[PDB]
Amino acid sequence: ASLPHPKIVKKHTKKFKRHHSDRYHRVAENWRKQKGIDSVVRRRFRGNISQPKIGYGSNKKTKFLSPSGHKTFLVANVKDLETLTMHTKTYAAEIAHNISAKNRVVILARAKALGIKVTNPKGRLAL
Amino acid sequence: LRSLTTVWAEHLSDEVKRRFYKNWYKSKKKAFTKYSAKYAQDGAGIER
Amino acid sequence: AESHRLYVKGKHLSYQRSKRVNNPNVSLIKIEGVATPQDAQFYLGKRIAYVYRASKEVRGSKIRVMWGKVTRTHGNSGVVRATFRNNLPAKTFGASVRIFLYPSNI
Amino acid sequence: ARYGATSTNPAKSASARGSYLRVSFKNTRETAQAINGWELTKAQKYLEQVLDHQRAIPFRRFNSSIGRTAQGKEFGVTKARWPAKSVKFVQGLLQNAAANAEAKGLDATKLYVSHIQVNQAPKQRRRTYRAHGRINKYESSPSHIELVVTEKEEAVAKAAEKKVVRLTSRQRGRIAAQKRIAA
Amino acid sequence: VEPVVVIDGKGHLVGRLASVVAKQLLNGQKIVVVRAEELNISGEFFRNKLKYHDFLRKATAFNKTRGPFHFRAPSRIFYKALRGMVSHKTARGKAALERLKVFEGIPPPYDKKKRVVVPQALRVLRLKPGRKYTTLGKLSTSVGWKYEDVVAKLEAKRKVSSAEYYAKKRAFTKKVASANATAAESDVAKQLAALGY
Amino acid sequence: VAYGYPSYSTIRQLVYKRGFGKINKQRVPLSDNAIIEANLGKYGILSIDDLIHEIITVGPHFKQANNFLWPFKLSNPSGGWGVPRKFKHFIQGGSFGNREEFINKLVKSMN
Amino acid sequence: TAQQAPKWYPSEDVAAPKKTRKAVRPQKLRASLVPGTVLILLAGRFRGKRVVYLKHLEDNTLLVTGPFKVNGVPLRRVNARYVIATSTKVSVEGVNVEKFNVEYFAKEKLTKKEKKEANEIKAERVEDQKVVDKALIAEIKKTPLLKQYLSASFSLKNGDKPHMLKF
RNA sequence: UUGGCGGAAAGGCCUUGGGUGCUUGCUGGCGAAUUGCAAUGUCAUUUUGCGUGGGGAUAAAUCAUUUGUAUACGACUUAGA
RNA sequence: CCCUGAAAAUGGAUGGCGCUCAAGCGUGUUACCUAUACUCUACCGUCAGGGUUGAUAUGAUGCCCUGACGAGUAGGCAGGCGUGGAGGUCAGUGACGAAGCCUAGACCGUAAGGUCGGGUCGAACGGCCUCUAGUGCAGAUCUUGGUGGUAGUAGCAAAUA
RNA sequence: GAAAUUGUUGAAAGGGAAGGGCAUUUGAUCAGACAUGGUGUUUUGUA
Ligand SMILES: [Mg+2]
Ligand SMILES: [Mg+2]
Ligand SMILES: [Mg+2]
Ligand SMILES: [Mg+2]
Ligand SMILES: [Mg+2]
Ligand SMILES: [Mg+2]
Ligand SMILES: [Mg+2]
Ligand SMILES: [Mg+2]
Ligand SMILES: [Mg+2]
Ligand SMILES: [Mg+2]
Ligand SMILES: [Mg+2]
Ligand SMILES: [Mg+2]
Ligand SMILES: [Mg+2]
Ligand SMILES: [Mg+2]
Ligand SMILES: [Mg+2]
Ligand SMILES: [Mg+2]
Ligand SMILES: [Mg+2]
Ligand SMILES: [Mg+2]
Ligand SMILES: [Mg+2]
Ligand SMILES: [Mg+2]
Ligand SMILES: [Mg+2]
Ligand SMILES: [Mg+2]
Ligand SMILES: [Mg+2]
Ligand SMILES: [Mg+2]
C-alpha cells in the first residue's frame, strides 16, 4: 500500500553503547564520547567498539522510513489526522500514549474510514 | 602389569569375609554365595 | 545402485585470514582429488551445500541446508574460495561439505 | 497478603508467614532451603532430628569459613550446622500453616512445602566500641519468613497442542508415492 | 577420503610426520599412528640425548608437580612434538587432538587393518646417505622408558602371526592369478584389453 | 618513481581506458570527442587521436595538451611487480629508476 | 497536536520507468547439444537417468523423452544447464516433435481456497508418448546394449574425476 | 549350525553342514509421469523414558552409638541384631 | 662454512614445535597469501563550480547537475539533542487515567535523544515560534544519605568456681 | 516506592577471571507485508 521504495539499508543495526556501560552500573548506556588521553576507544584500537560517525548515515531516500514503507506521524485527536488525508501513501498515523481509550476508538474509526494506516491499532483496547 | 582374572576358594571363613563389609552385624552375610555356586560342579567355571 | 552420490566431497578448512584477522564472509574449501588450480578451474561456479542436522523440526525435516558457491581458486594446491548466503558457523572447520555438478558446463 | 511468586492451586494450599523476626537471616535462609519441596511430616521429623544433633542443615551459600561435619554426607556436602533458633521459628510457622490447612479443610496427609522464602528485614542497630575511641555498627539481621503448603496431586494433564504442519507440493508428492508403493 | 588412517611409523622422521599428521587432524581426518618406537630423528644419538636432558632441566622451581611434564614413552614424545604443532588451547585444537591416537607397537584390532606410510616423511627418501640418525625406542629407554622388552616380545609374536597370515594370502593369490590367466585369451578379455582393462 | 619510454599502444590504452580532462577545475571523463573539441579546439586538437598524436609526437602544444589531461589513476599491477622487493633501483633488480623501455609491460599490467 | 506537521509532502504520483534498451534474442546453446544426443539428468525427480534429447523449445528449454517404455521417463521439458551431453548419438529423423511447444505443457494452478491433502493423467500425453517412443525404440534397437544403457542410471563411483572424465 | 585361533586395548578372525532370499552369467514382459525447469529432498548413530510379553536376583552404605593402632574439625581404624 | 677461544646465578625460548641433498647458509627463477594502501561501484557528510521565479502546489535558507575530499590531543568554529522556569499558539492531552517508575517488547535517528505497546499509579502535563538560566556528571583521598564483599569471619579468654 | 544489595521461581553458561568487537549456528522472542483499483455481476441484504 505504501509508495514504492528501494531496498532499506541501515549499515549499522547495533545500538552504539557507551564504553564500560557493561562494567559499572553508574555508567549509563547512552552514548558519550571518550575524551581520555590514553583511551583505546578514542584511539580506535582494533578489537574495540565502533564509534558513531557520519559515515554511517542512512540513505536520504530511505531516511525516516518505517519497514512498512511509511513515515511515522504522531496524532493527538481527530483534527490532526485530517492533515494526512491526501498523504496516505507516505505517512502513517500513530496515536499518542496519552490518548484515552474512548478517544482512541473514534480516532481509529476515522482512520479506517479514510484509509489511513495506523501503526498501533491496539493501544488500550479492551477485550 | 595388569590382573586379568581372579580365582577364589570354594569356602571362606567368617573372619576373612568380614573384610568385605563395613557393617557386618546388620547384613545377610551373602559373600561369595553365588560364587560358591560356581563350584558344586566338577571344574566348569573354575578349572577353565 | 548401491551408490547414489551426485556430488564431490569437500572439507571446510578455514575462513579467509591473516595471522591475526579472519574474514568470515569468505570460506576456504578443499576438494578431494584436486591438487592444482588448473584442475580446480573446472570447479568454479558450482553450488555447495552444507548439510547439518537439528533437533527441532522446522518445515517437515531434521535437515537444514547452507547454500553457497565457489568464487575463485586459492593457492597452488587447488584449494578454492567459497561464499554462502549465510557464512558457515566456524564450528564446521574440517566438516564435510557437498559440491554438486551444476551449473554444468560440459 | 502478597506472598512471593508461587505457581500452585490456591484452593489446595494454605499459607503462614512471619515478619520482623529477630533471627539471623543467613541461618534462616539455609534452614528454609533444607525443607523446600519436602513432605510436611517428614520435614517436621527432620527438624526434630536437627534440634538434638541427629541431622544437620546443609549450608550451600552462607558457608564461608565454617567447619565440616560427617552429617552432611546425606546431602553430599561437608559444611553443615544446627541453627536451633531458625529451626524453632521455622517449625513454629510450620505448625501455624498446618493449623491453617486444617481450618481450610485439607486432608493434612498429602501436604508438602510447595513454597518457602526468606528475605532480609530492617536492621536493629546497636553500638560496639573499638580501640582508640572509635565506634562501629553492631546490628541484628532479622528475617521475613513465609511459606505455603499444598496437597500433592496426581499427573497434571496431557494432550498438548495439535502441532499443525505445512507441507510443500514436492513433499506431498513424495508422501503420495511412498504410500502408493507401500501399504 | 578415509574413515581412519593407520600410519606405520617405521622409518619416518618425527618432525615431518608430526607436521603431516597435524595438518591432517586440522582437516578432520581421523589418524592413528602405530609402532612409535621406530620413529627416527635426524642426528647422532648423543645429540638428541643431550637435547632431551636439556629439556628435562626445565621445570617449575617452586613446585615440580606443576611444571612441564617430561613424558618418556616414544608415543608420548611424538605426541608432545605434535601437540605444540596444533593450537591445543582452543576447542578446535582439543577436538583436533581427540582425533589422534599414538600407539607403541601394533596393538589389537589396528593389527588387522592396512597400514600406510608417508613418503615425504620417510627416512630413506628424506635423509642423505651417510647422515646419522636415531631410533626413538633406544632414546626413550635411555631416558627412562621401562617397557622396551615387552613391546619387542609382542611385536615378535605379531610379526609371526602376520607371517602365517601372508603365507595363506600369497597361496590364495597364486590360485587367483592362475585362474585369471586361464580366463584370459577369451573374447571378454579381448574387449577388456581393447577398452583398457 | 618508475619511469621509461612509453609506446603508442600504451598511451592509446591509457587515453582510452582512463582518459579524464581538467575542465573548469573538474575531472571530467572524456568518453566523447565533443569535450576535446570544446576545450582544445584552439590548439588544432579535435579528437582523442589528435590528443594521442600531440602526446606521442611532442608537438608545439604538448604542454597544454598534457596539462589538460588529469593525472592517470592506475591500479596495482595485475601480474605483480615481478621483483620480490620494490624500493631499490631496477638495475639492482628493484622497481624504481629508468626502466627505459620495459615500462610498457608494467603500465599495461597496472592499467 | 502531538506532532506538528511536515511543511512539504512528497509527491504521490508514481513515475514511469525509462525506456529499457535490453532487447531479447535467442540462445546460443553449446555445440555439444545436438538433437538425438543422450543426456543425464543432474537434478529433479529423474536425476541420474540416461535419456534422449529431441528439440530446442521456445522458452530456452529442451524437449526430452526417455523413451518412457525403456526407463519410465515420459515426454518432459528440461533445462540445458542441468544436463550433460554424451558422445552417444541417436538418429532422431522421422519423428514429429513439432506438435510439442511451451503451451503443450500447462499446469492449471488451483485456487488457494481449495487445498487437498488426500491427492489424474491426461490421455493425449499418454498417446503422444506411446507414438513417439515406439518409433524411437525402432532405432535404439539397432545399436547393441544401448537399450540397457538407457535403462541404467548414471552414478559416480570412487575414483571418478569429472574434470578428467569424458561423456 | 560345527569346530578351532586370538589377552597388548583379546570383544574379533577363520571354519562345517543345511535352509532361506537374491543373483545383471544370459533372453524376455509389465510399471514409472503431476515432485510440473533446481531448492539435502530426509534413508546414519547417540543416549534416555514410557509401554507392552519373556526370562533372570532378591543388597548395601551413611547418620546415630562404640573403639583409639587416628584425629583441630573432617577423615582413618574398630565393634554392636 | 664449521670448530676452540666462549664462565652466573628461578626453568626458557631462531615466537613455539621442530628442522640435517633442511623447514640452515649464498644466490636465481617463478606461483601463491594479504592492509583502514591503489582501480571501480553504491551510500553519508563537507567544500567548490553551476542550473532552476513560469503558471499550479507546499518549502528560493527549496529542488537539481557536476568534481574533489574525509586521520587527529591541546584549541577554534558550526549544526543539532536534553532540563527548570516566561510570552504566544495548537479553542493540544487528561480521573473512560497526566506525571513518575519498571519492561534481554517495537519503531525512528550516525548520535545526543524521540515515539509506541504492557504492568504500577492517581492529578496534572505536552508539541511548535520565541525568552531566560542556580541547565546535562564517573571520577575531585568530592558533600549528604543508603548498601555490599570481607563474614556468620575476627572474636565475646585478667580478677581461682 | 527507583538504584546499589538481597530472597524465591524460571532460563542459560561455567578445566586458574568475567565483561567486549566482527560473522554465523542453535534456542527463545518480535514486526511488517500478503485487501491491491481492476475482467467483473457464476450475487446475496439487489444497488
Ligand atoms: Mg551500567
Ligand atoms: Mg598519549
Ligand atoms: Mg576459607
Ligand atoms: Mg577460625
Ligand atoms: Mg571492645
Ligand atoms: Mg575513652
Ligand atoms: Mg593472482
Ligand atoms: Mg615483496
Ligand atoms: Mg661459535
Ligand atoms: Mg617458517
Ligand atoms: Mg635459499
Ligand atoms: Mg579485501
Ligand atoms: Mg499513565
Ligand atoms: Mg533491566
Ligand atoms: Mg490526591
Ligand atoms: Mg551549577
Ligand atoms: Mg555519581
Ligand atoms: Mg571525567
Ligand atoms: Mg569517595
Ligand atoms: Mg569464631
Ligand atoms: Mg581476648
Ligand atoms: Mg508506600
Ligand atoms: Mg535491584
Ligand atoms: Mg580450582
Short mmCIF file of N, CA, C and O in Angstrom, two decimals, chain E residues 2 4-10 12 17 31-34 113-119 122:
data_model
loop_
_atom_site.label_atom_id
_atom_site.label_comp_id
_atom_site.label_asym_id
_atom_site.label_seq_id
_atom_site.Cartn_x
_atom_site.Cartn_y
_atom_site.Cartn_z
N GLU E 2 39.22 -41.24 3.83
CA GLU E 2 39.22 -42.46 4.61
C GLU E 2 38.58 -42.23 5.97
O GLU E 2 38.72 -41.15 6.55
N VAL E 4 39.36 -43.73 9.01
CA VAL E 4 40.54 -43.54 9.83
C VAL E 4 41.75 -44.01 9.04
O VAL E 4 41.62 -44.83 8.12
N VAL E 5 42.92 -43.48 9.38
CA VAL E 5 44.16 -43.78 8.68
C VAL E 5 45.16 -44.33 9.69
O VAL E 5 45.37 -43.73 10.75
N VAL E 6 45.76 -45.47 9.37
CA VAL E 6 46.74 -46.11 10.23
C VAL E 6 48.11 -45.98 9.56
O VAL E 6 48.33 -46.54 8.48
N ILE E 7 49.02 -45.25 10.20
CA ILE E 7 50.33 -44.97 9.65
C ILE E 7 51.35 -45.88 10.32
O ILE E 7 51.44 -45.91 11.55
N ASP E 8 52.12 -46.60 9.51
CA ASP E 8 53.23 -47.41 10.01
C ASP E 8 54.41 -46.48 10.28
O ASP E 8 55.00 -45.93 9.34
N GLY E 9 54.77 -46.31 11.55
CA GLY E 9 55.75 -45.30 11.91
C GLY E 9 57.18 -45.65 11.59
O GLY E 9 58.04 -44.77 11.67
N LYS E 10 57.46 -46.90 11.22
CA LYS E 10 58.84 -47.31 10.99
C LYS E 10 59.47 -46.51 9.86
O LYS E 10 58.88 -46.36 8.79
N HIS E 12 60.21 -43.27 9.67
CA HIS E 12 59.76 -41.90 9.47
C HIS E 12 60.59 -40.93 10.29
O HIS E 12 61.31 -41.32 11.21
N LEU E 17 56.67 -36.13 9.98
CA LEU E 17 55.45 -36.88 10.21
C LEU E 17 54.52 -36.13 11.14
O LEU E 17 53.30 -36.15 10.96
N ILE E 31 43.21 -40.01 12.57
CA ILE E 31 44.55 -40.55 12.41
C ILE E 31 44.90 -41.40 13.62
O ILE E 31 44.60 -41.04 14.76
N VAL E 32 45.54 -42.54 13.37
CA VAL E 32 46.15 -43.34 14.43
C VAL E 32 47.52 -43.80 13.95
O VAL E 32 47.66 -44.29 12.83
N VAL E 33 48.54 -43.61 14.79
CA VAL E 33 49.92 -43.94 14.45
C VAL E 33 50.34 -45.15 15.27
O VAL E 33 50.10 -45.20 16.49
N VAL E 34 50.98 -46.12 14.62
CA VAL E 34 51.42 -47.33 15.29
C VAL E 34 52.93 -47.45 15.16
O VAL E 34 53.56 -46.82 14.30
N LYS E 113 44.31 -54.29 10.28
CA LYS E 113 43.97 -53.31 9.27
C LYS E 113 45.22 -52.92 8.49
O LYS E 113 46.35 -53.14 8.93
N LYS E 114 45.00 -52.34 7.31
CA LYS E 114 46.10 -51.95 6.44
C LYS E 114 46.80 -50.72 6.98
O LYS E 114 46.15 -49.76 7.40
N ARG E 115 48.13 -50.75 6.98
CA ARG E 115 48.95 -49.63 7.40
C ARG E 115 49.49 -48.89 6.18
O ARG E 115 49.72 -49.49 5.13
N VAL E 116 49.69 -47.59 6.33
CA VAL E 116 50.14 -46.74 5.24
C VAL E 116 51.37 -45.97 5.72
O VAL E 116 51.60 -45.83 6.91
N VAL E 117 52.16 -45.50 4.76
CA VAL E 117 53.35 -44.70 5.04
C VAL E 117 53.24 -43.38 4.30
O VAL E 117 52.50 -43.24 3.33
N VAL E 118 53.98 -42.40 4.79
CA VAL E 118 54.02 -41.06 4.21
C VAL E 118 55.37 -40.88 3.53
O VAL E 118 56.39 -40.69 4.19
N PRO E 119 55.41 -40.93 2.20
CA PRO E 119 56.71 -40.86 1.51
C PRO E 119 57.49 -39.60 1.79
O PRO E 119 58.73 -39.66 1.86
N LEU E 122 59.56 -40.11 5.11
CA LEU E 122 60.33 -41.33 5.33
C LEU E 122 61.81 -41.01 5.40
O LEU E 122 62.30 -40.08 4.76
#
